[PDB]
Design a protein around this ligand. Structure first.
Ligand SMILES: N[C@@H](Cc1ccccc1)C(=O)O
Length: 405
């Protein structure tokens, strides 16, 4: 019926957590980040060259070994617990992740590999991979996107190698956790690690854009780094975040067996960066086959500056859909998964526009506005109407909604 999922050779029995769609599974193994002459592959290769050629360390440049072919199938221990993410944390919700079952999932971030690669004794590495998230539908969100993770560890004498009294300064102490440092980190060590992290990323961004770009650092929170930041780029008059980063939580680094090391880590969104770097308006464009988009990244070398040229934009068709919710058996993201399945890359966005409760029946009603717009052509009213009608019938069959229309 709907038991057992088979993926990349292996078999995953379904259960109460399982919520993959066939549609999302058809994207696993595509590995756009590894597809020669794809925009995302291009960014990856330029980041690789920056760390192989331009990073500089007081000892030597750390060798950043590159892992761009790790399977996206991970345990919840890799994806969450290894990163100190609490058991009650909202990032674990079934509404937000693609679970194969209670124990295996599609990784929601490339940070799901930090512990394993630290555990193998690496001091510096890059991880590049497709990641998976259940979320809303708009031009900035897609069920699969791509991240590049970097981790860089320091020994005590390496970090203090430029100073005249180095072997009396230390990495570790026992004090209190502040806005600026972890409880077991010295302020001396954190200031140097933070400086190296931000200098590295600032130079990487100048390597990718130019020297005129406006960036800012925004303090934020992650369970697996502290202090932590998001880097934001000002683009089309708006500050857009492109990465998260910070000083790695020492419990994580210690638990992987690197107890004599302090580190930084960052994770950048390749689509978010690519959309700024090349002015790409819609994330669906990374997945189309229109040569008008694809050929622009086929360049002679990975440093030939591609000057992406805008595509024509086609008119939209807007249709509403209203139904009564099942009696306490419904998630917004379930409907978005269904729209992706039926509507696919015809759908530009979905907004929940209205909700209310009916007193006589106690039923909740949702109304969603669906914006149909194709990236490659004009849609006819007719094909959209039939697709929209098919969506309504699938919604009744599969989600147990009650058509209100
Ligand atoms: N994993 C974070 C990014 C990040 C990576 C490494 C350190 C800190 C933050 C995300 O997906 O948003």
């Amino acid at each position: 019926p709907g038991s057992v999922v088979e993926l990349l050779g292996k078999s995953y029995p379904q259960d109460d957590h399982s919520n993959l769609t066939r549609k999302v599974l058809t994207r696993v193994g595509r590995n756009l980040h590894n597809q020669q002459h794809h925009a995302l592959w291009l960014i990856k290769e330029r980041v690789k060259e920056h760390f192989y050629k331009q990073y500089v360390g007081r000892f030597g440049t750390p060798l950043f070994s590159v892992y761009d072919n790790l399977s996206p199938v991970v345990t919840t221990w890799q994806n969450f617990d290894s990163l100190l993410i609490p058991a009650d944390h909202p990032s674990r919700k079934k509404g937000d992740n693609y679970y194969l079952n209670r124990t295996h999932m599609l990784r929601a971030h490339t940070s799901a590999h930090q512990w394993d690669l630290l555990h193998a004794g690496l001091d510096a590495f890059l991880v590049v991979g497709d990641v998976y998230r259940r979320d809303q539908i708009d031009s900035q969100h897609y069920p699969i996107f791509h991240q590049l993770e970097a981790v860089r560890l320091f020994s005590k004498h390496e970090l203090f190698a430029g100073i005249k009294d180095g072997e009396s300064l230390q990495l570790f102490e026992q004090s209190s956790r502040s806005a600026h440092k972890q409880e077991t980190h010295t302020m001396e060590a954190v200031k140097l690690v933070e400086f190296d992290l931000k200098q590295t990323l600032t130079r990487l961004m100048a390597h990718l854009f130019g020297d005129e770009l406006e960036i800012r650092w925004v303090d934020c929170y992650f369970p697996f780094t502290h202090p932590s930041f998001e880097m934001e780029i000002n683009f089309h008059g708006e500050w857009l975040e492109v990465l998260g980063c910070g000083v790695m939580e020492q419990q994580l680094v210690n638990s992987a067996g690197a107890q004599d090391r302090i580190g930084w880590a960052f994770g950048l969104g390749l689509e978010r960066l690519a959309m700024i770097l090349y002015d790409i308006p819609d994330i669906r464009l990374f997945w189309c086959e229109d040569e008008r988009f694809l050929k622009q990244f086929c360049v002679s070398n990975i440093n030939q500056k591609v000057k992406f040229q805008p595509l024509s934009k086609y008119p939209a068709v807007i249709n509403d859909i209203s139904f009564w919710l099942p009696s306490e058996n419904y998630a917004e993201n379930d409907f978005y998964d269904l729209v992706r399945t039926i509507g696919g890359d015809l759908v530009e966005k979905v907004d929940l526009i209205d909700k209310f409760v009916h007193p006589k029946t106690h039923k909740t009603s949702h109304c969603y506005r669906i914006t149909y717009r194709h990236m490659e052509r004009t849609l006819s009213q007719r094909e959209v109407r039939h697709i929209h009608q098919a969506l309504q019938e699938a919604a009744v069959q599969l989600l147990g909604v009650e058509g209100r229309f």
